[PDB]
Amino acid sequence: APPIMGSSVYITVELAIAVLAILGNVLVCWAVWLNSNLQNVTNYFVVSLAAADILVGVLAIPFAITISTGFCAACHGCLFIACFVLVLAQSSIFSLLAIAIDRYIAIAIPLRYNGLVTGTRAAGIIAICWVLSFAIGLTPMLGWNNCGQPKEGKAHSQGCGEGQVACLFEDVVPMNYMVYFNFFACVLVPLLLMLGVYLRIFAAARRQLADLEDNWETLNDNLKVIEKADNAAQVKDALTKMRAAALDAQKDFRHGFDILVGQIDDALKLANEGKVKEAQAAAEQLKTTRNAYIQKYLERARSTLQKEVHAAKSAAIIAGLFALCWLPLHIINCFTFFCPDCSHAPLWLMYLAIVLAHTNSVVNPFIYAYRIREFRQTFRKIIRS
Numbered sequence: 552a553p554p555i556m557g558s559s560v561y562i563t564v565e566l567a568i569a570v571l572a573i574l575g576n577v578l579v580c581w582a583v584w585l586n587s588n589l590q591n592v593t594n595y596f597v598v599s600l601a602a603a604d605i606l607v608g609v610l611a612i613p614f615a616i617t618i619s620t621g622f623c624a625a626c627h628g629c630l631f632i633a634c635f636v637l638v639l640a641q642s643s644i645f646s647l648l649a650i651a652i653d654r655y656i657a658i659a660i661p662l663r664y665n666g667l668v669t670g671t672r673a674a675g676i677i678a679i680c681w682v683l684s685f686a687i688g689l690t691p692m693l694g695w696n697n698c699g700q701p702k703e704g705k706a707h708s709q710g711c712g713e714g715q716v717a718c719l720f721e722d723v724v725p726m727n728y729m730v731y732f733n734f735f736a737c738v739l740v741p742l743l744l745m746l747g748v749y750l751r752i753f754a755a756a757r758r759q760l761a762d763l764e765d766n767w768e769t770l771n772d773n774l775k776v777i778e779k780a781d782n783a784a785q786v787k788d789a790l791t792k793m794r795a796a797a798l799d800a801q802k803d804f805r806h807g808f809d810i811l812v813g814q815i816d817d818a819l820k821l822a823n824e825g826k827v828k829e830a831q832a833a834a835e836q837l838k839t840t841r842n843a844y845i846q847k848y849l850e851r852a853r854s855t856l857q858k859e860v861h862a863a864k865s866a867a868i869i870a871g872l873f874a875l876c877w878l879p880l881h882i883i884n885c886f887t888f889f890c891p892d893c894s895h896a897p898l899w900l901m902y903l904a905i906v907l908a909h910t911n912s913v914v915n916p917f918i919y920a921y922r923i924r925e926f927r928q929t930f931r932k933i934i935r936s
């Protein structure tokens with residue numbers, strides 16, 4: 552069949568993806584620029600990720616369309632157009648890992664987060680990560696390439712000049728680089744590290760939510776212990792544990808905890824004097840403080856943790872969708888490399904895996920719109936105005 556037919560389908564789909572990747576990701580950048588509620592460290596990595604996706608539309612897709620022709624090119628110029636997408640994928644990986652780490656610092660050490668993670672430090676990390684992405688993605692230009700063993704028969708058949716090759720990705724980029732270096736070391740290891748970080752985020756949230764409920768149950772159980780106590784010593788023992796728990800949870804809400812600790816201290820002083828009935832009556836006053844302050848604190852803390860779980864799930868879905876979209880091309884590369892007795896994956900499947908990898912540059916704006924109210928409302932305001 553005339554090659555122009557299948558190539559026309561591939562090219563049209565690539566151009567459609569390029570348009571959507573540019574539109575959605577420009578909208579993400581626009582939202583962060585205009586809305587100060589979206590201007591935080593986490594979202595500077597989101598913008599770095601959107602910038603890599605805009606460049607997939609502006610540059611990697613025009614380069615992929617050019618490469619699909621197998622046009623004659625100077626081998627090192629061919630390597631640049633073949634490898635530029637690896638720089639963007641590597642930058643995306645560093646941005647995804649930075650977002651996971653940022654979310655883990657936020658849940659594990661919230662009191663130290665604002666002092667540790669600043670916009671100035673994030674901007675430096677983004678700059679370093681872009682430099683490292685160029686070094687990793689363009690490692691073939693440094694000499695790990697097939698330019699020293701050109702396919703001269705293919706170059707002659709196409710009328711290529713001296714020092715030129717038919718510019719085809721698998722002719723110039725070594726598969727040992729694609730599998731061991733690019734895939735195993737630079738993609739799979741960071742994705743497994745991201746998986747580890749997300750597991751730790753969810754475990755930390757689960758433990759912190761369980762600790763909020765345990766402290767609330769302990770306060771209520773100890774009030775009953777005091778109510779059913781048969782002497783001042785049993786009231787004292789229960790108030791001693793309550794005072795320690797109140798101080799541990801204190802590490803309008805500050806006023807509430809001041810009242811709580813004070814009321815426990817009043818009851819404890821009475822219990823130390825052998826005044827069981829007066830100590831039990833003083834301990835009953837803790838219910839007023841629990842109802843007016845402590846319950847509100849517990850609800851607000853639980854709500855905050857639930858918002859962090861929801862935000863970490865949104866971030867993990869984007870990392871998982873990056874893995875889903877890119878794994879097929881990497882897995883095909885593993886078959887090409889490790890199974891030389893296997894027929895190469897057919898050209899239609901190679902085009903499909905490339906298109907799927909490109910589609911990853913369209914999806915993040917949709918995940919933000921569906922899962923993040925602040926993005927959704929800002930997108931609505933930009934589109935309306």
Ligand SMILES: CC(C)CCC[C@@H](C)[C@H]1CC[C@H]2[C@@H]3CC=C4C[C@@H](O)CC[C@]4(C)[C@H]3CC[C@]12C
Nearest residue numbers: 610614623624625626627628629630631632715
């Ligand atoms: C700021 C942005 C938009 C600049 C983009 C510049 C791009 C399009 C340029 C920079 C380097 C260029 C390549 C350098 C060398 C060669 C080898 C030649 O035999 C065929 C063209 C080819 C493969 C060029 C294609 C276009 C190219 C990739």
Ligand SMILES: CC(C)CCC[C@@H](C)[C@H]1CC[C@H]2[C@@H]3CC=C4C[C@@H](O)CC[C@]4(C)[C@H]3CC[C@]12C
Nearest residue numbers: 874875878879880882883886893894895896897
């Ligand atoms: C990431 C998730 C969705 C899993 C994706 C698995 C894909 C990439 C797998 C599943 C079955 C695989 C194919 C199974 C058999 C062959 C025949 C062999 O001669 C070339 C590779 C080829 C054609 C494989 C390419 C990769 C393949 C298509």
Ligand SMILES: CC(C)CCC[C@@H](C)[C@H]1CC[C@H]2[C@@H]3CC=C4C[C@@H](O)CC[C@]4(C)[C@H]3CC[C@]12C
Nearest residue numbers: 739878881882883884885886887889890891893
């Ligand atoms: C956690 C998961 C997603 C990590 C990725 C798993 C990858 C590395 C696995 C999944 C399936 C595997 C392939 C399954 C079958 C074959 C055919 C064999 O003749 C050579 C190895 C090869 C080609 C394997 C290479 C490694 C492979 C591609």
Ligand SMILES: Nc1nc(-c2ccco2)nc2c1ccn2-c1ccncc1
Nearest residue numbers: 614615618633636720721880881884905
């Ligand atoms: N086998 C291939 N693998 C890859 C690739 C990128 C990341 C993981 O695998 N890209 C490929 C091919 C064959 C063609 N291309 C490609 C690369 C860049 N521009 C167009 C096509």
Ligand SMILES: CCCCCCCC/C=C/CCCCCCCC(=O)O
Nearest residue numbers: 595598599602670671673674677681
């Ligand atoms: C080859 C073309 C150029 C490739 C590199 C492009 C890099 C673009 C990066 C932009 C992301 C910026 C995100 C915001 C950083 C923090 C802002 C700040 O706090 O000052």
Ligand SMILES: CCCCCCCC/C=C/CCCCCCCC(=O)O
Nearest residue numbers: 878879882883886890891892893894
């Ligand atoms: C989540 C990642 C899952 C990855 C699954 C990868 C695909 C697994 C299937 C492997 C089947 C390989 C069959 C190769 C047959 C070649 C036969 C031959 O030509 O000699």
Ligand SMILES: CCCCCCCC/C=C\CCCCCCCC(=O)O
Nearest residue numbers: 608609610612613614616617620622
């Ligand atoms: C938004 C600006 C950047 C996008 C520009 C898009 C340009 C058009 C798309 C494809 C690149 C051109 C492909 C050239 C193939 C040359 C093939 C050959 O020489 O045989």
Ligand code: NA
Nearest residue numbers: 603604643912
């Ligand atoms: Na990306």
